[PDB]
Design a protein around this motif. Structure first.
Motif, short mmCIF file in Angstrom:
data_model
loop_
_atom_site.label_atom_id
_atom_site.label_comp_id
_atom_site.label_asym_id
_atom_site.label_seq_id
_atom_site.Cartn_x
_atom_site.Cartn_y
_atom_site.Cartn_z
N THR A 42 5.47 5.11 3.55
CA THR A 42 6.82 5.39 4.01
C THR A 42 7.80 4.98 2.92
O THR A 42 7.72 3.86 2.41
CB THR A 42 7.14 4.63 5.30
OG1 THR A 42 6.09 4.84 6.27
CG2 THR A 42 8.48 5.07 5.87
N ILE A 43 8.72 5.87 2.59
CA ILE A 43 9.79 5.56 1.64
C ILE A 43 11.03 5.23 2.44
O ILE A 43 11.50 6.06 3.23
CB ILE A 43 10.06 6.71 0.67
CG1 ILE A 43 8.79 7.11 -0.08
CG2 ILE A 43 11.17 6.31 -0.29
CD1 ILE A 43 8.93 8.40 -0.86
N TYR A 44 11.54 4.02 2.25
CA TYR A 44 12.81 3.58 2.79
C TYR A 44 13.86 3.71 1.69
O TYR A 44 13.63 3.23 0.58
CB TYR A 44 12.72 2.12 3.25
CG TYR A 44 11.69 1.87 4.32
CD1 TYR A 44 10.36 1.63 3.99
CD2 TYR A 44 12.04 1.90 5.67
CE1 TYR A 44 9.41 1.39 4.98
CE2 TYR A 44 11.11 1.67 6.65
CZ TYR A 44 9.80 1.42 6.31
OH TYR A 44 8.86 1.19 7.31
N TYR A 45 14.98 4.36 1.99
CA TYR A 45 15.97 4.56 0.94
C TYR A 45 17.38 4.43 1.49
O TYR A 45 17.62 4.73 2.66
CB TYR A 45 15.80 5.94 0.28
CG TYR A 45 16.01 7.11 1.20
CD1 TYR A 45 17.27 7.68 1.37
CD2 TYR A 45 14.94 7.67 1.88
CE1 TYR A 45 17.45 8.78 2.23
CE2 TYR A 45 15.11 8.76 2.73
CZ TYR A 45 16.37 9.31 2.89
OH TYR A 45 16.54 10.40 3.74
N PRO A 46 18.32 3.96 0.67
CA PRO A 46 19.70 3.84 1.15
C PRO A 46 20.36 5.20 1.26
O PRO A 46 20.22 6.05 0.38
CB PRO A 46 20.38 2.97 0.09
CG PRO A 46 19.21 2.28 -0.68
CD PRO A 46 18.13 3.33 -0.65
N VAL A 81 15.14 1.69 -3.28
CA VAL A 81 14.23 2.69 -2.71
C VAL A 81 12.84 2.07 -2.72
O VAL A 81 12.33 1.70 -3.78
CB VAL A 81 14.26 3.99 -3.52
CG1 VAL A 81 13.26 5.00 -2.95
CG2 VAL A 81 15.69 4.58 -3.54
N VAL A 82 12.22 1.94 -1.55
CA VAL A 82 11.01 1.14 -1.41
C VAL A 82 9.95 1.96 -0.69
O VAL A 82 10.20 2.48 0.40
CB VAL A 82 11.27 -0.16 -0.63
CG1 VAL A 82 10.02 -1.03 -0.64
CG2 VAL A 82 12.46 -0.93 -1.21
N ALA A 103 0.41 4.95 -8.68
CA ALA A 103 0.51 6.28 -8.09
C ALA A 103 1.66 6.37 -7.10
O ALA A 103 2.29 7.43 -6.97
CB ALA A 103 -0.81 6.65 -7.41
N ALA A 104 1.96 5.27 -6.41
CA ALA A 104 3.05 5.25 -5.45
C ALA A 104 4.41 5.29 -6.15
O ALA A 104 5.33 5.98 -5.69
CB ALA A 104 2.93 4.01 -4.57
N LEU A 105 4.56 4.54 -7.24
CA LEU A 105 5.76 4.67 -8.06
C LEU A 105 5.93 6.11 -8.53
O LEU A 105 7.02 6.69 -8.46
CB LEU A 105 5.67 3.74 -9.27
CG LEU A 105 5.79 2.23 -9.00
CD1 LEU A 105 5.51 1.44 -10.28
CD2 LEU A 105 7.17 1.91 -8.44
N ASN A 106 4.85 6.70 -9.04
CA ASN A 106 4.96 8.07 -9.55
C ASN A 106 5.31 9.04 -8.44
O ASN A 106 6.05 10.00 -8.66
CB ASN A 106 3.65 8.47 -10.22
CG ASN A 106 3.51 7.83 -11.57
OD1 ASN A 106 4.50 7.62 -12.27
ND2 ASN A 106 2.28 7.49 -11.95
N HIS A 107 4.80 8.79 -7.23
CA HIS A 107 5.13 9.67 -6.11
C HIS A 107 6.62 9.65 -5.81
O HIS A 107 7.25 10.70 -5.62
CB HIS A 107 4.35 9.29 -4.86
CG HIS A 107 4.63 10.21 -3.71
ND1 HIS A 107 3.81 11.26 -3.39
CD2 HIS A 107 5.68 10.26 -2.86
CE1 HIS A 107 4.33 11.92 -2.37
NE2 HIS A 107 5.46 11.33 -2.02
N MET A 108 7.21 8.45 -5.75
CA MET A 108 8.65 8.35 -5.51
C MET A 108 9.44 9.10 -6.57
O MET A 108 10.43 9.78 -6.26
CB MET A 108 9.07 6.88 -5.47
CG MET A 108 8.66 6.15 -4.20
SD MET A 108 9.46 4.54 -4.10
CE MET A 108 8.65 3.74 -5.49
N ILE A 109 9.03 8.98 -7.83
CA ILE A 109 9.80 9.58 -8.92
C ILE A 109 9.57 11.09 -9.03
O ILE A 109 10.48 11.84 -9.39
CB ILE A 109 9.48 8.86 -10.24
CG1 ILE A 109 10.02 7.43 -10.21
CG2 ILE A 109 10.01 9.64 -11.45
CD1 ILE A 109 9.43 6.54 -11.29
#
Length: 262
Positions: A42-46, A81-82, A103-109
């Motif tokens: 799950t990505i939490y973002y402002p 963004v977490v 891989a999770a960092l890359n997914h967000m970006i």
């Protein structure tokens, strides 16, 4: 202000101890099938139209995303963004968890919606993890000196010597941990980190290995202060880290060490 990365109101103890920070957060679901190299999350973002640093958080052995969900949302609500992840399997070892944090960092970006991607400053990234996930965050930090911060929570890795890490690292230990005892894990890990990097050791009082898996005002406060100071370069938060939490009767922690001043 002069620092372009400052977000949110001037901090206080009360504001950092609150259940939620000042930023309204939304969620983007990352299905297991959409995830390349991790198990979904799950990505939490402002919702506010800023850019923010991005953080990936891994759980530990047998742990699911739910074991770290509260901390991802709390951190995001202070202006990050977490992504909280599931791993590929619940039995994955720390070095596999390091690859999945990457891989999770890359997914967000690269792979999240434009809503998420447009809110990330992809040059300001951090990693966190619980237990074996904390070991994963240490391994990835050792491989990626470009990361801005690492927060291993009650960490374990086969290797305790992380002298190669130059990423600002906050080690959080639990005094009653019998699964990754601070005597053999967190403290050897922390003392391996060089004197010349920004680092701190925070040992919770009356805390088991699972203290990070339920909402914890101390973990939330100092995780946010660490990410603020080193992902955002936000010197409004230096005062929380240096000299840092007090121990003893009226204190917040069992023990705190640091390479302050920051």
């Amino acid at each position: 202000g002069m620092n372009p990365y400052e977000r949110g109101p001037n901090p206080t103890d009360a504001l950092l101890e609150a259940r939620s920070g000042p930023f309204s957060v939304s969620e983007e679901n990352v299905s297991r099938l959409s995830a390349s190299g991790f198990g979904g999350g799950t990505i939490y973002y402002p919702r506010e139209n800023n850019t923010y640093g991005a953080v990936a958080i891994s759980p530990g052995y047998t742990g699911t995303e739910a074991s770290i969900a509260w901390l991802g949302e709390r951190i995001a609500s202070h202006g990050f963004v977490v992504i909280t992840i599931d791993t590929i399997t619940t039995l994955d070892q720390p070095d596999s968890r390091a690859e999945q944090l990457n891989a999770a960092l890359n997914h967000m970006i690269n792979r999240a919606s434009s809503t998420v991607r447009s809110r990330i400053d992809s040059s300001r990234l951090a990693v966190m993890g619980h237990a074996m996930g904390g070991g994963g965050s240490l391994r990835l930090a050792s491989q990626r000196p470009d990361l801005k911060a690492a927060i291993p929570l009650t960490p374990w890795h086969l290797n305790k010597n992380w002298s190669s890490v130059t990423v600002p690292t906050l080690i959080i230990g639990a005094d009653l941990d019998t699964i990754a005892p601070v005597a053999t894990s967190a403290k050897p890990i922390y003392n391996s980190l060089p004197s010349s990097i920004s680092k701190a050791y925070l040992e919770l009082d009356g805390a088991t290995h699972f203290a990070p898996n339920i909402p914890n005002k101390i973990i939330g406060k100092y995780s946010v202060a660490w990410l603020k100071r080193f992902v955002d370069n936000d010197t409004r938060y230096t005062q929380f880290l240096c000299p840092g939490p007090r121990d003893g009767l009226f204190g917040e922690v069992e023990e705190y060490r640091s390479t302050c001043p920051f």
